[PDB]
Structures are given as C-alpha cells and as structure tokens.
Design a protein around this ligand. Structure first.
Ligand SMILES: COc1ccc2[nH]cc(CCNC(C)=O)c2c1
Ligand SMILES: COc1ccc2[nH]cc(CCNC(C)=O)c2c1
Ligand SMILES: *[C@@H]1O[C@H](CO)[C@@H](O)[C@H](O)[C@H]1NC(C)=O
Length: 345
C-alpha cells in the first residue's frame, strides 16, 4: 500500500481546482526512485470536459481519492511480482489534468478548468526532494498510455529541474509504456491529430524545447507522437509498445472473418510500428493485440525472443553503468496478433 499526500502548494490543482497529489511508499534501504504517471485519455473543449466531469470525475478531481493504493506490477514491492525494482521507493501520481500531462494553465475567470499536468510533475519532484529523493542515484519516470506520452513530454524537463536545483548526481531516465502512436491513415473515416491540436490551445500545453524548435509555432501537435519527439530527447528512454495496440486500432476505426483489405491494413500497421522502433536501442514490442502492461500483476509473463520485460529492463540498467545474453532491443518480426505465444489472453 502506497499512502496519499496532497500537494502542500495548493495552487497546483486538478481540473476542478482541488489539490493534486501523489501516493508514496518509502524504501529506506534504496537509492532508486520510481515515479509512475497514470493514464486515462484526455478532453479538449468545454463540452467534452463537462461530460468527463460527470462520469470520470476521479480523473478531474482529488475530492474523492482514497487514502491508500496497492502497488501492482512494476510498483509492487514483492520480488515474485516485480523482479526488476521490488526494493525501490514507489510513487504513483494520479492523472487529474486531462491534458496528456502537458498543461500549464490555472482556473480563472476566463478558464472553467485548470490544466496543470506539466506543473504537477515538477511540484511532486520538488516536494519529494525533502522526503529522501535528494539522496537518489536514479529517478525513473514511468507511465502508461496517456502517462507514457507524458514521460516523453516531461523526462527532459525533470532532468533540467534537478540540475538547476543543484542535484547533478541524480540520473533521470524514462520508461514509456503504450504511449507510442502513429498519425497514420485510418481504415475508415468517422481525428486525434486535430483533437490534440485544439487541446494544446485549450490547455496552454507545453512540449520539449528541441522538438518545439524543430516544428515551430502552430505545429507542436507533432511532439505528441513518439517517433517524432524521441530523437530530440537527451535522457535515456526505454519504449514499451504492443505492435497492435488496442487504442491505436480504435482511433483507426478497426473493430475485430477478416477480409483482404483489413488483413493488409493490420499487417501494414505492424510493419510501420516496427520501422519506427528500428533506431530505438532500448525497446520491447511484442506482436499482440493489447493495451498497457507495466502495472499489470502478470507483466512478468510476456516474452520477446525468449526475454521477459523485467529482464530487458535489468539489462538496460546494466547497459547504463552489447551484453552477452542480456539484450535491450526486443521487437517481434512476426506479422499478425498472437503470433507470439506469450501474448495475454
Ligand atoms: C490514449 O490517449 C492518448 C494518449 C497520448 C497520445 N499521444 C498522441 C495521441 C493521439 C493519437 N493516439 C490516440 C490513441 O488517439 C494520444 C492519445
Ligand atoms: C497518412 O495519410 C494521412 C492523410 C491525411 C491525414 N490527416 C490526418 C492524418 C492522421 C490520421 N491519423 C491519426 C491516428 O490521427 C492523415 C493521414
Ligand atoms: C506554487 O505553484 C505555483 C505554480 O507553479 C508557483 O507559481 C508558486 O511559486 C508555488 N508556490 C510556492 C510558495 O513556491
């Protein structure tokens, strides 16, 4: 169980103005710190945020959060469940800003909602430095789905914050799970790129500086797509992505007797995802239809080329000190979902 702490700076808020916060379980024998960003889609205008407030209020407000949370998967403290980092200090940061962790906007007379995801991360990091983070050797910023994209948008900002605060010994790294999407041609029409474009204006969203300077004013939506923002990052980042991600297929208007047109569409999607990962040295991408993995209790079960994800992350740790029998780049080459026998059922 991790215990809830509301932010002492109560001007850093969830969408409705309630204070944001974090759940913490300390491990006093450890110099490793894991900060996990929750996911949960987003909203991008008044009407669609109003509907989210009716039926997804815990993703917009802290008024109804519980005092504790159980750590699962990579957040578990049991070695049987978490072979990688069971002895680490564990932090779960709830997602209550609906902005893919990019916002820097307060509630005001002109703004019904606050969008402060980027500021929430920096305030958590600050307040944690007085609870033991000042002694850390490694800070791993991790996250799933919207939180995985949040890692890509924020890991370099955390690194810069700690250097300017006077903590150059802390090594900042990122782990992005299920947040690596393609701005591809859809199977049918009914678009995420335009929703993100409008969202950035609504949230006053911020993106990493080198990416912003490449794409320039008006085109910051490009930095929400992993294969475009990743080459601009300086911190080491490990990318986890199912080749046939369910959220990707949903926005592509695919719902699973598959005939030739859809077969070719699905096979081309896996090929394109594989291609975007060829220059990503630390990555784990199985040929499965699924979504998210790192906080699932059975995350230890899936393997690529005989190597589990906990093992791949351990090999990554060793590489940041070409290891024999300890690989870090693991991408499936077979072309259809569940061609890998370790895929979840
Ligand atoms: C799950 O919601 C998210 C989270 C992070 C994201 N980054 C970029 C996009 C838009 C394209 N992908 C989808 C699923 O629409 C996005 C959506
Ligand atoms: C590749 O062909 C095209 C052509 C025109 C387009 N407009 C917008 C998109 C991106 C659509 N994908 C998602 C997931 O948002 C697009 C793609
Ligand atoms: C609280 O957070 C806000 C938003 O980042 C910041 O402007 C302010 O300086 C913070 N308060 C203190 C006392 O540092």
């Amino acid at each position: 169980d991790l215990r809830l702490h509301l932010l002492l700076n109560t001007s850093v808020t969830c969408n409705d103005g309630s204070p944001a916060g974090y759940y913490l379980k300390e491990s006093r024998g450890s110099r490793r710190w894991l900060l996990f960003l929750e996911g949960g889609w987003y909203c991008f205008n008044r009407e669609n945020c109003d509907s989210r407030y009716d039926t997804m209020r815990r993703l917009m407000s802290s008024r109804d959060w519980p005092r504790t949370r159980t750590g699962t998967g990579i957040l578990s403290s049991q070695p049987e469940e978490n072979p990688y980092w069971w002895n680490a200090n564990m932090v779960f940061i709830p997602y209550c800003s609906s902005d893919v962790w990019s916002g820097a906007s307060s509630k005001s007379e002109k703004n019904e909602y606050a969008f402060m995801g980027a500021l929430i991360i920096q305030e958590v990091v600050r307040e944690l430095l007085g609870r033991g983070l000042s002694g850390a050797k490694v800070l791993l910023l991790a996250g799933s789905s919207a939180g995985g994209t949040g890692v890509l948008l924020n890991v370099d900002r955390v690194a810069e914050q700690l250097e300017k605060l006077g903590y150059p010994a802390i090594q900042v790294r990122g782990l992005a799970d299920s947040g690596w999407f393609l701005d591809n041609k859809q199977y049918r029409h009914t678009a995420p790129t335009e929703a993100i474009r409008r969202g950035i204006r609504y949230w006053n969203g911020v993106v990493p500086e080198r990416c912003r300077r490449q794409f320039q004013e008006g085109e910051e939506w490009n930095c929400f797509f992993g294969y475009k923002v990743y080459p601009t990052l300086r911190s080491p980042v490990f990318v986890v992505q199912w080749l046939f991600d369910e959220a990707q297929l949903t926005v592509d208007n695919v719902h699973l007797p598959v005939q030739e047109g859809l077969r070719l569409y699905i096979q081309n999607l896996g090929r394109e995802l594989r291609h975007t990962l060829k220059d990503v040295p630390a990555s784990f991408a199985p040929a499965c239809l699924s979504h998210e993995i790192i906080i699932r209790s059975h995350w230890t079960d899936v393997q690529v080329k005989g190597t589990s994800l906990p093992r791949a992350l351990h090999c990554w740790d060793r590489s940041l000190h070409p290891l024999k029998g300890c690989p870090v780049h693991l991408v499936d080459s077979c072309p259809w979902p569940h061609c890998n026998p370790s895929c979840p059922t």
